[PDB]
Design an enzyme around this catalytic site. Structure first.
Site, short mmCIF file in Angstrom:
data_model
loop_
_atom_site.label_atom_id
_atom_site.label_comp_id
_atom_site.label_asym_id
_atom_site.label_seq_id
_atom_site.Cartn_x
_atom_site.Cartn_y
_atom_site.Cartn_z
N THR A 67 -17.91 4.01 18.57
CA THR A 67 -19.00 4.58 19.36
C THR A 67 -20.20 3.64 19.29
O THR A 67 -20.69 3.32 18.20
CB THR A 67 -19.37 6.02 18.92
OG1 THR A 67 -18.26 6.90 19.15
CG2 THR A 67 -20.55 6.54 19.71
N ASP A 90 -8.54 0.84 4.59
CA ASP A 90 -9.37 0.79 3.40
C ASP A 90 -10.74 0.26 3.80
O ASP A 90 -10.86 -0.46 4.80
CB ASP A 90 -8.76 -0.13 2.33
CG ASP A 90 -7.36 0.33 1.88
OD1 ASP A 90 -6.99 1.49 2.15
OD2 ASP A 90 -6.65 -0.49 1.25
N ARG A 118 0.84 -1.20 0.00
CA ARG A 118 0.00 0.00 0.00
C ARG A 118 0.87 1.26 0.00
O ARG A 118 0.54 2.26 0.63
CB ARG A 118 -0.96 -0.01 1.20
CG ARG A 118 -1.99 -1.14 1.19
CD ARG A 118 -3.05 -1.01 2.29
NE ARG A 118 -3.81 0.24 2.18
CZ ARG A 118 -3.84 1.19 3.10
NH1 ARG A 118 -3.16 1.06 4.24
NH2 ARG A 118 -4.55 2.29 2.91
N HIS A 144 -8.01 6.96 6.58
CA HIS A 144 -7.95 6.21 5.32
C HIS A 144 -6.54 5.84 4.87
O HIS A 144 -6.37 5.00 3.98
CB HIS A 144 -8.69 6.96 4.20
CG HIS A 144 -9.19 6.09 3.09
ND1 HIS A 144 -8.43 5.09 2.50
CD2 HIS A 144 -10.37 6.09 2.42
CE1 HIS A 144 -9.13 4.51 1.55
NE2 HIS A 144 -10.31 5.09 1.48
#
Lengths: 216, 216, 216
Positions: C171, C196, C17, C192
């Site tokens: 949450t 992903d 990545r 991000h």
């Protein structure tokens, strides 16, 4: 004419939330949105039993809450934190012909018949003024953006510059039938510095309370 | 050989939103995400009746709706607001083996049979290319993000920066079964300088019809 | 006396990545919130078949997941991307009397019985400490927020400065009856550059999984 409004300088050192505010002012600063499918079944039916339409009525119910809890009435004065004695609703009005919208504010009164009178007089007057802000801004105000087009399961607001932006924003949606109940999406945006999840959380239960009480 | 495309140099002066935009580009700039629980009971059926993978059919309805309303196809070019003559979809395609993803755009055609053919020819080629952008940036494009994993009730996209970020973003979800009905979550990310809740509202309203209408 | 818990440092060149991270750390940088209508029917009954408080049991599952996938256990150390061998749950606790909340962290263990012992003691020890962080900052932790006040359809967290802020934030909401099922609103916010849609996707699908296996 002549005015002056709710200055209530809070000294942050004697406050039970002193570092909470401090942290969310600096390094941990953020706003947040939550949305609820709100039961309005009893509200609507009692709003239809009267000849009023569901908007100023709802505006009023929110305004009442905003004028109960000081955590919604906070802003920044001359480099200081204040609590307005009162906060007034700044709602959106839509223009069919030009496909634009104006935001304008009425003066809040506890008495619903008093408030609606102020509202109606303002909307019957400026409702066709194309000025973005036909009555301009005012120091002590909160926001209600009608979103009648969409039965949204989430409305998130995402402000670029949230510094000292404490004034809360309500976005309200297109109501719908579901079971016996008629539900209606409502979203709030609050600066975490002035509202812990608890604060937002109880006001959404008193909003559910007051919608099952009366018109106002 | 060459291309050259899009532009309608909008004058702020004549525009019915000159100040909406102006104030939403400094003082009170923001974006907003809203999510909906979409009826595709009629869409899915028609799509499953024909030899069409779901994805590209939706990307096309989203395409049609971008290329109908000037408000979406807006971007800041050479320091000025323009509206591109057309906008091409930029969709995510997932890579199993590596557990990464790639976004790749396909040139948009109003005729659906045309588009799916360009879409196929595009993914047949690049679908197994490991470049984040196997084809690259294209001035005039909007986004669709595949999210077939989660049947989400909300999806906010929170840009760290939004200066002149006008190209919208769609995120579609894991669809599911309900009351004889099939629903699927979609979200839009828009910039409130170019998109009032109205525009965004009706575009989701047409999305219902266009889905309860044929494939494309 | 002394600690030193290790990273697993990541080189950006060998990592699959390499430009997903680089891009999502520069021009395209953002965070994103998604909410789910989690099914906790099984997780509830099995919690109530034991004498266990709901909160800590859930917190456990969340950590179980966090400590199963490296992508959630990432942070910045010295201008370097690292992976904490383990990550600990940082949860909130509410104070009725003063209407504020404090956040504290228990040391994670795979064994549920071990973790609950450490949690129960931490809460029994600090639950009435009016300090915003009675234990405080630890590099390797993820977040949980109690929001038992509202069955929210959307919770979006809108952080101001997301730079390297990779620690994921959960949450959870007011769980509710809905026909033979009991659903509990849950949201995750992630950066991000390290998460992903797929990563956050499967984590929620395993979250559903564990909530249908045992307490922990």
């Amino acid at each position: 004419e002549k005015k002056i409004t709710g200055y209530t300088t809070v000294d942050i050192s004697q406050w039970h939330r002193k570092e909470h505010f401090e942290a969310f002012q600096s390094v941990a600063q953020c706003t947040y949105n939550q949305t609820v499918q709100l039961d309005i079944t009893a509200f609507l039916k009692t709003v239809k039993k009267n000849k009023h339409k569901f908007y100023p009525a709802f505006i009023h119910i929110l305004a009442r809450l905003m004028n109960a809890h000081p955590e919604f009435r906070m802003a920044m004065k001359d480099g200081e934190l204040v609590i307005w004695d009162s906060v007034h609703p700044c709602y959106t009005v839509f223009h069919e012909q030009t496909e634009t919208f104006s935001s304008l504010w009425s003066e809040y009164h506890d008495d619903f018949r008093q408030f609606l009178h102020i509202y109606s007089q303002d909307v019957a007057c400026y409702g066709e003024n194309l000025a973005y802000f036909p009555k301009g801004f005012i120091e002590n105000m909160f926001f209600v953006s009608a979103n009648p087009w969409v039965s949204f399961t989430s409305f998130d607001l995402n402000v670029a510059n949230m510094d000292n932006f404490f004034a809360p924003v309500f976005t309200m949606g297109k109501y719908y039938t579901q079971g016996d109940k008629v539900l209606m999406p409502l979203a709030i945006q609050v600066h975490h510095a002035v509202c812990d999840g608890f604060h937002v959380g109880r006001m959404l239960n008193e909003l559910q309370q007051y919608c099952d009480e009366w018109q106002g």
